[PDB]
């Protein structure tokens, strides 16, 4: 089997990506955030606390044929921007793109945090990290991913982000239409359960590659790219007037500028961010001041490839027996 959905920016900076998702029968179709970073499927539902609901789609179990309660099940996650959500948990029928996996958990929010109530277009996370970090307790569940695997034409899904644009999740296949020259492998460590690589490296606008190891993670759901302060003071240092503000969270500058791009290395292949990927706009409506894409990940604990870094190029996330990550130009 495959499945090939399109995802879709929730805003005008590429904030976050929303892919859409049919979950019980008949279907209801929720508008997910599939985190690469992450590995619990919860949603928005009629069991979600009535004050912390603001516009998103609801799953109602009561209303799906094929749903069960997943009895004693519960699941609490807390994630690297300090959002949280819990509830409890039902299994169902879940398809993405026309692939379709019977059984799956679908965790129901009975409680979600401010950011999520705040955010009316994303109606809940699809993670796609291993399933060793799956919350759901006391006995832990497969993402959809593990779950599909072994129907599955290849044991692969794809990311292919947009610029301010949609783009594409497969799954059990490789578009060989969808990059360009070849596709670069580089190993993974799960220790940590994510999609862990180490890069060889970066360069600065049309400066010299620096050859370094920056071990991070592969992350659909986190917007920006964060990495070492060297590195990131680096970057900064060629953009006139920028600073790290600590009232402001990170690195900013001037609207005016120009940015640079920003290679980094997967293996002997590179993958050029342009400068435009970097620009996240004002810090607030009608300031000059604007956010920068790529940030300190120091007090993190992790280097993270987010939105940025992955926009710019097609991933390649191989679950086969020993995993690996891919990468090409497009
Ligand atoms: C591991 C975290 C820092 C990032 C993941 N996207 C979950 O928030």
Redesign the pocket.
């Known amino acids: 089997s495959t499945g090939s959905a399109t995802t879709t920016p929730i805003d005008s900076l590429d904030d976050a990506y929303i892919t859409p998702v049919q979950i019980g029968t008949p279907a209801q179709t929720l508008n997910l955030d599939f985190?690469?970073?992450?590995s619990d499927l919860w949603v928005f539902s009629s069991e979600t606390t009535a004050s912390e609901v603001d516009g998103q789609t609801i799953y109602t179990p009561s209303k799906s044929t094929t749903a069960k309660l997943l009895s004693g099940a519960t699941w609490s996650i807390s994630?690297?921007?300090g959002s949280s959500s819990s509830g409890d948990v039902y299994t169902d029928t879940v398809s993405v793109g026309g692939l379709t996996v019977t059984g799956q958990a679908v965790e129901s929010a009975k409680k979600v945090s401010s950011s999520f109530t705040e955010d009316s277009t994303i109606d809940g996370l699809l993670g796609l990290a291993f399933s060793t970090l799956n919350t759901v307790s006391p006995t832990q569940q497969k993402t959809f991913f593990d779950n599909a695997k072994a129907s599955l034409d290849s044991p692969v899904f794809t990311a292919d982000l947009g610029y301010h644009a949609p783009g594409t999740y497969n799954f059990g296949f490789i578009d060989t239409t969808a990059y360009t020259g070849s596709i670069t492998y580089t190993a993974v460590s799960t220790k940590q359960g994510?999609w862990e690589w180490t890069s060889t490296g970066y360069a600065v606008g049309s400066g010299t590659f620096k050859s370094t190891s920056i071990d991070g993670?592969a992350?659909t759901?986190?917007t920006l790219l964060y990495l070492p302060a060297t590195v990131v003071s680096a970057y900064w240092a060629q953009v006139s007037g920028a600073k790290s503000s600590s009232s402001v969270g990170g690195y900013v500058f001037p609207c005016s500028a120009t940015l640079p791009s920003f290679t980094f290395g997967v293996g002997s292949a590179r993958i050029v961010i342009p400068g435009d990927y970097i620009d996240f706009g004002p810090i607030s409506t009608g300031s000059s001041s604007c956010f920068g894409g790529i940030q300190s990940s120091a007090g993190?604990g992790?280097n993270?490839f987010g939105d940025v870094a992955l926009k710019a190029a097609f991933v390649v996330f191989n679950g086969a027996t020993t995993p690996t990550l891919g990468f090409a130009s497009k």
């Not at 985190?35 to 992450?38: F, H, I, K, P, R």
């Open positions: 985190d690469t970073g992450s994630y690297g921007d994510f993670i992350d759901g986190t993190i992790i993270i």
